[PDB]
Amino acid sequence: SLTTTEVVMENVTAFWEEGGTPVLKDINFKIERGQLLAVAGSTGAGKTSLLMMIMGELEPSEGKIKHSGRISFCSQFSWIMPGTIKENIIFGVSYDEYRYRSVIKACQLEEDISKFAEKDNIVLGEGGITLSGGQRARISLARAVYKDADLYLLDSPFGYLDVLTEKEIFESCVCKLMANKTRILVTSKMEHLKKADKILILHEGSSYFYGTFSELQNLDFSSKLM
Ligand SMILES: Nc1ncnc2c1ncn2[C@@H]1O[C@H](COP(=O)(O)OP(=O)(O)OP(=O)(O)O)[C@@H](O)[C@H]1O
Numbered sequence: 001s002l003t004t005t006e007v008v009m010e011n012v013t014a015f016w017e018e019g020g021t022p023v024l025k026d027i028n029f030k031i032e033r034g035q036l037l038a039v040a041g042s043t044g045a046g047k048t049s050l051l052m053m054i055m056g057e058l059e060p061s062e063g064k065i066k067h068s069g070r071i072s073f074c075s076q077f078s079w080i081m082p083g084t085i086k087e088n089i090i091f092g093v094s095y096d097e098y099r100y101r102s103v104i105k106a107c108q109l110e111e112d113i114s115k116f117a118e119k120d121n122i123v124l125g126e127g128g129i130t131l132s133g134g135q136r137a138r139i140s141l142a143r144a145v146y147k148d149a150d151l152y153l154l155d156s157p158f159g160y161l162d163v164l165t166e167k168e169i170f171e172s173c174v175c176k177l178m179a180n181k182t183r184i185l186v187t188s189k190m191e192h193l194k195k196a197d198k199i200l201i202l203h204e205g206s207s208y209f210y211g212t213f214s215e216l217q218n219l220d221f222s223s224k225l226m
């Protein structure tokens, strides 16, 4: 009877356009501190909107959202500010060389940085147009992981990566480096769902499944979707 709960949603319904159809309807879940929740579902299902509710950017019309803590958010827009790679990753936080190194290794940036003589000190322009798609994605993830937060909201960080790079980062970063952090990972990959503490599958704004992977194996659409 000591509770470890970090995020709760109870009977949550929300509208982006207050009057039409809800973007999220009757959503219920809870995440305990240090757990990984995988959020899956087709394009447009409401996955990012769910993260937005957690961040206070979308308010419910019904229900309650409970969370107290610092959030770090890795958006679908893999964005880059003018400045160095190092400056992009640290992004206004205090510098901790041990932490910085652990994050660049876990996000598979070691080999990319170590390529130039100027290492991670070379200035990027806004957009980081001289980087590869995957470099931009990894720098964006590294930024979110470097922040010292209580809840990590990782919105499909692996979209632009090849399947081998994605596997290595999911294992080193999400599963290992962040093992004791509360994480919500938007992903529909079945291998990732296996490793999650809990799973929420959304469909057209409603909950299609919520529970453990063993509870999912016992039941489908998810096997088509993943
Ligand atoms: N800020 C917003 N204002 C108005 N409508 C929005 C907003 N954000 C999302 N929507 C709409 O709500 C629906 C759900 O969008 P959302 O971004 O949550 O989907 P998603 O599950 O993240 O999809 P994807 O996998 O494509 O990223 C979409 O039809 C989208 O057009």
Ligand SMILES: [Mg+2]
Binding pocket: 047, 048, 049, 076, 155
């Ligand atoms: Mg999205």
